[PDB]
Amino acid sequence: CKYDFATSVLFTEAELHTRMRGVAQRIADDYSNCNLKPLENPLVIVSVLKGSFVFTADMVRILGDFGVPTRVEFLRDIRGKHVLVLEDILDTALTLREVVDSLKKSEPASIKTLVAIDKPGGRKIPFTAEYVVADVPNVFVVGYGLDYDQSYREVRDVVILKPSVYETW
């Protein structure tokens, strides 16, 4: 392992960006029917959890490459607007269930979710994201915005943190 604080690298930055491009093509296709436009009708990106800023920065740039204009809001007026909620990780689904339910009260045109890392085995309630960059098993990861006690967000890859790190802390 190229990092002394990690036991395994699960997804490199290159692997994540390749998958993000695949997802962006699907988003571009799915929203082509919506006549999105800068200013007049952007896709509203709602970025949720502090760590999602890395994913959000990379994803909105990729979506722009694919012709999907956005505006960004951070949770860390959508009435009649299309909303895409972005989260770096989906685990119990308790965060997204609450966010999506709250945003629904403002009656957006539609609401969908995009997550960088899904941990499908972590659910405490049923929840399926419309778009998932990558799946992880039930292990604790850091990097690509994900932290351990506010550190390691800047690791370019998604990695499994060594037990020694969090015992030596």
Added chain:
Amino acid sequence: CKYDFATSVLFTEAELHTRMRGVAQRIADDYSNCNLKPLENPLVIVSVLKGSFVFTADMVRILGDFGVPTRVEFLRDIRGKHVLVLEDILDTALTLREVVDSLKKSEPASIKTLVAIDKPGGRKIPFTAEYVVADVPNVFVVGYGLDYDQSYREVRDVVILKPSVYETW
């Protein structure tokens, strides 16, 4: 011009990243005397203005490459900690003057500022950022996190917005 909404491209994403690497080397050198460490003593990145999330995402990853561990806070406990305030653009300096003065009240170990775009000719008060990625003349730019009425943040380059865009709006 490669964009139909811009009259000029001022800095490409590639140009910005090259300059960010030069700045990161200076930051790494300047903070080598501080014994920064994940968890125990990270550099505290305070990211200011909604648009700074793109710059912040790219910069913390570059700083990690250069061995500078960070934690991030967004303004959009530092007592005894080193703080680096990041802003996508510095113009009148009124924002950073207030932010730096407020953070000083919590007595950090030190406080410095890093901005992606400086408009040196825009000052309403004297202010010099410790680290500047790029300088722009007194023109209104979008891209690399910078918006016009919440749109165009996702443009990968820093560009001059066409007058037609903001009259046709």
